[PDB]
Design a protein around this ligand. Sequence first.
Ligand SMILES: *C/C=C(C)/C=C/C=C(C)/C=C/C1=C(C)CCCC1(C)C
Ligand SMILES: [Cl-]
Length: 218
Amino acid sequence: VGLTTLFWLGAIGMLVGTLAFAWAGRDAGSGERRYYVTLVGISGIAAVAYVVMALGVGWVPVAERTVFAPRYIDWILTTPLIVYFLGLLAGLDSREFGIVITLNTVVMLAGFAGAMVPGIERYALFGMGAVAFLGLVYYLVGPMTESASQRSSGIKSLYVRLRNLTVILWAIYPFIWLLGPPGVALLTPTVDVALIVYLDLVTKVGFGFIALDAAATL
Ligand SMILES: *C/C=C(C)/C=C/C=C(C)/C=C/C1=C(C)CCCC1(C)C
Ligand SMILES: [Cl-]
């Protein structure tokens, strides 16, 4: 199994999620539609990014490594949508959304920038992202959880389930980044991509399926 193959697998998984979310939201009352649309965009954008990488585009040479630019474009656009989904579920107002969305953006921008910087100073960008990430986790586990507590028992339960999925799985990315080509380059590009393809699929499609389950049960 090579990079190309791993990218195709990611494209296929994202496509399956995209189609399922689009279908399940066919009707969608008039206030629940928002959730389905966000899911379609999250997995849809990732699907495109993976096909692009699978076709060999965006493989940017940096120092003695390769940076998959599409992955980062994908993250920068999709992770804020995931955060939006959680904030909607938690019942946040504009100001609340604004804070978590910017922290999220700082994480992804710093990571992309760090990956694109050849020198050892790139770790300074990585650190910036790590710090903003802790801020994001704080909001997810604190204020946003407090806000969610004002919703029905089911919604609060779905929020908690997805919050846990997000906090735990997202916290893993920085380590894979630090151990792979972007950092120490211990893990080969293939192993790093394999691990990240799984993580992307679960944080997006796994995330979506869990939500659909809750919606159905509700
Ligand atoms: C669908 C894609 C997802 C859910 C991607 C998530 C990515 C992260 C949580 C990345 C985090 C990073 C840090 C916390 C430190 C700086 C470097 C990053 C970008 C790998
Ligand atoms: Cl990369």
